Amino acid sequence: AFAGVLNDADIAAALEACKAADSFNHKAFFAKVGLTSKSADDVKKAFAIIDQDKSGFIEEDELKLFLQNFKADARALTDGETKTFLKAGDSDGDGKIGVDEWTALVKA
Ligand SMILES: [Ca+2]
Ligand SMILES: [Ca+2]
Numbered sequence: 001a002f003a004g005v006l007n008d009a010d011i012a013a014a015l016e017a018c019k020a021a022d023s024f025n026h027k028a029f030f031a032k033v034g035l036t037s038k039s040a041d042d043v044k045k046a047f048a049i050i051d052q053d054k055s056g057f058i059e060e061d062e063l064k065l066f067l068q069n070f071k072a073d074a075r076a077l078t079d080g081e082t083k084t085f086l087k088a089g090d091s092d093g094d095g096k097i098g099v100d101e102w103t104a105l106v107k108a
Contacts, residue, residue: 001070002049005042010034011070018067024081026088030106033070040103047102057096060086 001008014032018024030036035046048054050069052062064082067074077085089097089105097105 002046005038005045006034006070015067015071015074019075021075021078022080024067024077024085026085026105035106038106043103043106044099046106047099050102057098058089058102059096063097 001011010033014029017032018029035043038046047058050058050062050066052065052069053059060082063085064077064079066077066085068076086095086097089101091101091104092098
């Protein structure tokens with residue numbers, strides 16, 4: 001749980017909602033978890049947390065573990081949920097998400 005970035009109560013509620021396999025929706029999640037309200041600074045901080053290996057991009061393997069960044073015992077996304085999420089953010093087609101594609105994804 002992003003203790004110094006997001007309210008723990010909104011995370012619980014966002015995780016509760018996409019518990020069933022294939023029920024994940026990123027725009028629903030971002031809205032519920034409270035990330036959409038955030039400024040460019042906080043959105044960049046979120047990016048860094050998700051970019052587990054600090055390569056500058058969120059690769060497919062990290063995107064599949066997306067929920068675990070909020071709650072350690074959260075489920076992994078299905079390959080179907082991962083491909084959809086990937087395809088929505090990856091504006092340039094290199095197979096990964098950079099900080100600008102993330103910012104747009106979170107905000108638009
Ligand atoms: Ca990475
Ligand atoms: Ca990309």
